[PDB]
Ligand binder design. Sequence first.
Ligand SMILES: CC(=O)N[C@@H]1[C@@H](O[C@@H]2O[C@H](C(=O)O)[C@@H](O[C@@H]3O[C@H](CO)[C@@H](O)[C@H](O[C@@H]4O[C@H](C(=O)O)[C@@H](O[C@@H]5O[C@H](CO)[C@@H](O)[C@H](O[C@@H]6OC(C(=O)O)=C[C@H](O)[C@H]6O)[C@H]5NC(C)=O)[C@H](O)[C@H]4O)[C@H]3NC(C)=O)[C@H](O)[C@H]2O)[C@H](O)[C@@H](CO)O[C@H]1O
Ligand SMILES: CC(=O)N[C@@H]1[C@@H](O[C@@H]2O[C@H](C(=O)O)[C@@H](O[C@@H]3O[C@H](CO)[C@@H](O)[C@H](O[C@@H]4O[C@H](C(=O)O)[C@@H](O[C@@H]5O[C@H](CO)[C@@H](O)[C@H](O[C@@H]6OC(C(=O)O)=C[C@H](O)[C@H]6O)[C@H]5NC(C)=O)[C@H](O)[C@H]4O)[C@H]3NC(C)=O)[C@H](O)[C@H]2O)[C@H](O)[C@@H](CO)O[C@H]1O
Ligand SMILES: CC(=O)N[C@@H]1[C@@H](O[C@@H]2O[C@H](C(=O)O)[C@@H](O[C@@H]3O[C@H](CO)[C@@H](O)[C@H](O[C@@H]4O[C@H](C(=O)O)[C@@H](O[C@@H]5O[C@H](CO)[C@@H](O)[C@H](O)[C@H]5NC(C)=O)[C@H](O)[C@H]4O)[C@H]3NC(C)=O)[C@H](O)[C@H]2O)[C@H](O)[C@@H](CO)O[C@H]1O
Ligand SMILES: CC(=O)N[C@@H]1[C@@H](O[C@@H]2O[C@H](C(=O)O)[C@@H](O[C@@H]3O[C@H](CO)[C@@H](O)[C@H](O[C@@H]4OC(C(=O)O)=C[C@H](O)[C@H]4O)[C@H]3NC(C)=O)[C@H](O)[C@H]2O)[C@H](O)[C@@H](CO)O[C@H]1O
Ligand SMILES: CC(=O)N[C@@H]1[C@@H](O[C@@H]2O[C@H](C(=O)O)[C@@H](O[C@@H]3O[C@H](CO)[C@@H](O)[C@H](O[C@@H]4OC(C(=O)O)=C[C@H](O)[C@H]4O)[C@H]3NC(C)=O)[C@H](O)[C@H]2O)[C@H](O)[C@@H](CO)O[C@H]1O
Ligand code: NI
Lengths: 276, 274, 275
Amino acid sequence: QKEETNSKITKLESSKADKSAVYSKAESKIELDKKLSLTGGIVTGQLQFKPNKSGIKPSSSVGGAINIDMSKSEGAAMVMYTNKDTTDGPLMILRSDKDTFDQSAQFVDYSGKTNAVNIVMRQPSAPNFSSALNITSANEGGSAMQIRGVEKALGTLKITHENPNVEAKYDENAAALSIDIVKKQKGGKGTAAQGIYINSTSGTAGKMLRIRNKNEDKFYVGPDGGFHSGANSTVAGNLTVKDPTSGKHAATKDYVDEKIAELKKLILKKLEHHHH
Amino acid sequence: EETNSKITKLESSKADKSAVYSKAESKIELDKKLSLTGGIVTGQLQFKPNKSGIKPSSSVGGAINIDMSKSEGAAMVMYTNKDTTDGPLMILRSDKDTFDQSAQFVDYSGKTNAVNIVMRQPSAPNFSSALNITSANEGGSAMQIRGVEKALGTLKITHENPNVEAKYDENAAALSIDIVKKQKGGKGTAAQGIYINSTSGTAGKMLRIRNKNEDKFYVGPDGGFHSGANSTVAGNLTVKDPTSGKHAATKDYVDEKIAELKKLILKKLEHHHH
Amino acid sequence: KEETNSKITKLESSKADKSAVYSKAESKIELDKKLSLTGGIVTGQLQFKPNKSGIKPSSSVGGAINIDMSKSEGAAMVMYTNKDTTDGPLMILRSDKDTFDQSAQFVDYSGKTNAVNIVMRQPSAPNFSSALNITSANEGGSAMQIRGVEKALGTLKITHENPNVEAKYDENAAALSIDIVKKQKGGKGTAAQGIYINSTSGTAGKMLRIRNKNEDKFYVGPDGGFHSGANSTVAGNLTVKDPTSGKHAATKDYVDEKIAELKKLILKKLEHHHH
Ligand SMILES: CC(=O)N[C@@H]1[C@@H](O[C@@H]2O[C@H](C(=O)O)[C@@H](O[C@@H]3O[C@H](CO)[C@@H](O)[C@H](O[C@@H]4O[C@H](C(=O)O)[C@@H](O[C@@H]5O[C@H](CO)[C@@H](O)[C@H](O[C@@H]6OC(C(=O)O)=C[C@H](O)[C@H]6O)[C@H]5NC(C)=O)[C@H](O)[C@H]4O)[C@H]3NC(C)=O)[C@H](O)[C@H]2O)[C@H](O)[C@@H](CO)O[C@H]1O
Ligand SMILES: CC(=O)N[C@@H]1[C@@H](O[C@@H]2O[C@H](C(=O)O)[C@@H](O[C@@H]3O[C@H](CO)[C@@H](O)[C@H](O[C@@H]4O[C@H](C(=O)O)[C@@H](O[C@@H]5O[C@H](CO)[C@@H](O)[C@H](O[C@@H]6OC(C(=O)O)=C[C@H](O)[C@H]6O)[C@H]5NC(C)=O)[C@H](O)[C@H]4O)[C@H]3NC(C)=O)[C@H](O)[C@H]2O)[C@H](O)[C@@H](CO)O[C@H]1O
Ligand SMILES: CC(=O)N[C@@H]1[C@@H](O[C@@H]2O[C@H](C(=O)O)[C@@H](O[C@@H]3O[C@H](CO)[C@@H](O)[C@H](O[C@@H]4O[C@H](C(=O)O)[C@@H](O[C@@H]5O[C@H](CO)[C@@H](O)[C@H](O)[C@H]5NC(C)=O)[C@H](O)[C@H]4O)[C@H]3NC(C)=O)[C@H](O)[C@H]2O)[C@H](O)[C@@H](CO)O[C@H]1O
Ligand SMILES: CC(=O)N[C@@H]1[C@@H](O[C@@H]2O[C@H](C(=O)O)[C@@H](O[C@@H]3O[C@H](CO)[C@@H](O)[C@H](O[C@@H]4OC(C(=O)O)=C[C@H](O)[C@H]4O)[C@H]3NC(C)=O)[C@H](O)[C@H]2O)[C@H](O)[C@@H](CO)O[C@H]1O
Ligand SMILES: CC(=O)N[C@@H]1[C@@H](O[C@@H]2O[C@H](C(=O)O)[C@@H](O[C@@H]3O[C@H](CO)[C@@H](O)[C@H](O[C@@H]4OC(C(=O)O)=C[C@H](O)[C@H]4O)[C@H]3NC(C)=O)[C@H](O)[C@H]2O)[C@H](O)[C@@H](CO)O[C@H]1O
Ligand code: NI
């Protein structure tokens, strides 16, 4: 015992941490479990990104406010899933508001051996008016959509219509491609727009329009504009042509009339001076 | 004496080492958690909102919201250099056929292409596309496009020869259409290739075909056509009786002119005297 | 008294020093720098680098990020900008290996509106830009494919709408515009076709049907026969079959043979008439 164990007690009261002024390990676990671990976890509220002088890059490998690199991992980078019956908005939205914006909303830069982007609308229980992909532009200065391919032996755009039913005449009103040409919806007075415009700006040796059925040629328009039709055909009007110079060329009115006039002349000549 | 009270107050009121983290242990535990200023996540981050005030708003909504208004750079980049893998990079999925919104909505103002998909040149050509579209919904068009072009096509397709040699692409086309029966047990099809219409009515050509920018064939708004070269029908062609020199003559026209000449000649024959 | 120096040494041993632990307030400061699972604002780059981390391809539960909206209103993800200009696209998907055997994006959609919907809004000034641009340099495959099963519609539906009230303003426009070009770098030409229509199975339908105000104007039928609904022209000869009906076009052979028959009959009547 002394008078100075009271010094040692005061050193402990001074130098050791009070319970009320620090978190216990259990309180710490509680508070840490409310935070996202780098190894994964479940976010139940809104996660907002608001980068601001944050070194975010445009790079298509290392950029982005979010960047997901799957180079060393199996699996998808990102999945958005819903089994909801109905809801108040789309799964994914990309939006840009300034008409000076000089980049795309979405850029896909794809190397690989399957389809870069693949959009599937599954069979509904009841048919309805909806599409896999809808495109709309209100920009008059540009094509709403552009496609450019380098196919050796295929179409740049390939469209297949497939009968949804087993019965051969169920799809008789359907088409692979349907084109409409309309006046302005709000107060338009008409339109002069064309349906299909085909050109070859460099010049092609190929057929401009080729039609087949069961793989057999039925109708074509050649590079010179001449056509070949494979069956009986009709013009509800006159057909202007060149005068024929071969047996199966269509005859003109001039050709008929000239032939008639030649025969006439020869016969009238024989009539005016036959003797018995 | 009464210092055993003071000792018991310290044993009661002071924190035990075993029951609290050191500063060093705290750093370790904090470094495992994501800083608001950024970090690297190495596991799955799952979003499971549930009565969480998530909105549909195309500016402030989303379980994730990225606003790039005040920042340079991309909002999001998904990248892979992997040789092969077990699934697509991004997937959107909706399971109920009553679902009444889109999987993806792009709302774009700007002066370049809103969405831009590029398939790069492979080492070896293969059957794969930039964009593949499939619908099993018979009540709707698989794809729809609407544009308001002053002087362009709503859809522009260009085919470009992949090779220097002029004939290499002789089996290619800009647009290729096929019309097929149902794959599982179908008995045939009556579907059409191309259906063009103007529901309001157009003064324009329905089909206009050029080569090197010079008109070669067209179909006009009335259905009449102009062909720019020798042509063939493997069959009969029905026309109207000609009323001008270069109109094609009908069988009736030929026969009536033959009959008129006949009549005139037989009349002169039956009635001349010597 | 005397031996409580053991009890003091047990306190010096067992109790935490102030200097070696964070106060509650220091802890709050450090925790407030970290993201709460209930939400918050990230201001730097969030990087995902999974590496033997059990990430799956599943279109319901996979992904380094997975968003399930089954139990919640709202969008899964929103990317927005009101910026004037910037240095790159909002969203980017990129794959580098030409052996890569999956898609960049897969949309598996059931529902009753459009799966993917791309809208280019009206700009202040017309310009050359599109809602959707597609480009392939793969010669072995079609740049784009579409398959549909429509009962009574087109698989691809294209509408051109006049941007202006005046009827002739859009006279150079088209619903579909096709070009056929040689290779840009040193190409010697092309033999590619414009439009190729086929039915591999065989169709009873018209191959090409053109209407104006819903009335048939021109068509090509399943057999290749055409019907044109107005005055028409060939700048050249037209080969046809010899006519066997009144309105069939007459051939040169038909004209010549009928001329020769009449000739024969007349010369015969001439060499044998008597008065
Ligand atoms: C159908 C038809 O006939 N239409 C006619 C028009 O023709 C069309 O023109 C368009 C057009 O050019 O506007 C053509 O589309 C282009 O097609 C190209 C493929 O051949 C696409 O690459 C191009 O898209 C651009 O590609 C850039 C690229 O090279 O990758 C992208 O830029 C990169 O962006 C990323 C992300 O921001 C950056 O990371 C990257 O950078 C580099 O990053 C890195 C790194 O490691 O991350 C390293 C480097 O050091 C960095 O520099 C960018 N790269 C560069 C080079 O800057 C662009 O974002 C992307 O847009 C397509 N162009 C567009 C605008 O879409 C189409 O093929 C034609 O058909 C014709 O123009 C018109 C008038 O004549 O008439 C029409 O009828
Ligand atoms: C090719 C052809 O001829 N087809 C024929 C059919 O024509 C096609 O019709 C479709 C159609 O109408 O179904 C046309 O597609 C529409 O095109 C419009 C452009 O002209 C698009 O805007 C429209 O897309 C819809 O756009 C909505 C919009 O109002 O902009 C979106 O709604 C917004 O969604 C966001 C995100 O969920 C919400 O935030 C927002 O809300 C507001 O939010 C905010 C905010 O700051 O966030 C502020 C406001 O206070 C809130 O109210 C929504 N907006 C509002 C106000 O509701 C939709 O999500 C999006 O769908 C296109 N519509 C569709 C369904 O795709 C196409 O142009 C035509 O070609 C024709 O229908 C048919 C005739 O029988 O025949 C076909 O052959
Ligand atoms: C237009 C035309 O005539 N073109 C023809 C070609 O025709 C086309 O063939 C395509 C083809 O490649 O087969 C057809 O596309 C396929 O369409 C179906 C819908 O009918 C679509 O489902 C295919 O996408 C694939 O879908 C599967 C799926 O089963 O859902 C996806 O796999 C799944 O992935 C998720 C996520 O990773 C997993 O969770 C899930 O477990 C997994 N499921 C399974 C079973 O593994 C897969 O990712 C996806 O590819 C789609 N196929 C492709 C490759 O896109 C197209 O409809 C059709 O028109 C024709 O093939 C050729 C023949 O020479 O000629 C062309 O002219
Ligand atoms: C109304 C009419 O019949 N006009 C007659 C006129 O025919 C028209 O010719 C013009 C033309 O060649 O100038 C055609 O305009 C072309 O239309 C296509 C499709 O809409 C469009 O792609 C062309 O734009 C050019 O093409 C592209 C491209 O990306 O496709 C790039 C060029 O830079 C771009 O400008 C467009 N051409 C122009 C210059 O606008 C129109 O379709 C025809 O109807 C005919 O030539 C003359 C002489 O007989 O008479 C008129 O009455
Ligand atoms: C088999 C055959 O030759 N039928 C003859 C028939 O021609 C058919 O006419 C119908 C019709 O106009 O009623 C055509 O059907 C139309 O086909 C297109 C292309 O698939 C489709 O877009 C039409 O859908 C309508 O489209 C629109 C719209 O504005 O886009 C509005 C409507 O809601 C939508 O349904 C579709 N029309 C309908 C109602 O089915 C068909 O393609 C032609 O083959 C001809 O009219 C009659 C009389 O001479 O004879 C038949 O033999
Ligand atoms: Ni006589």
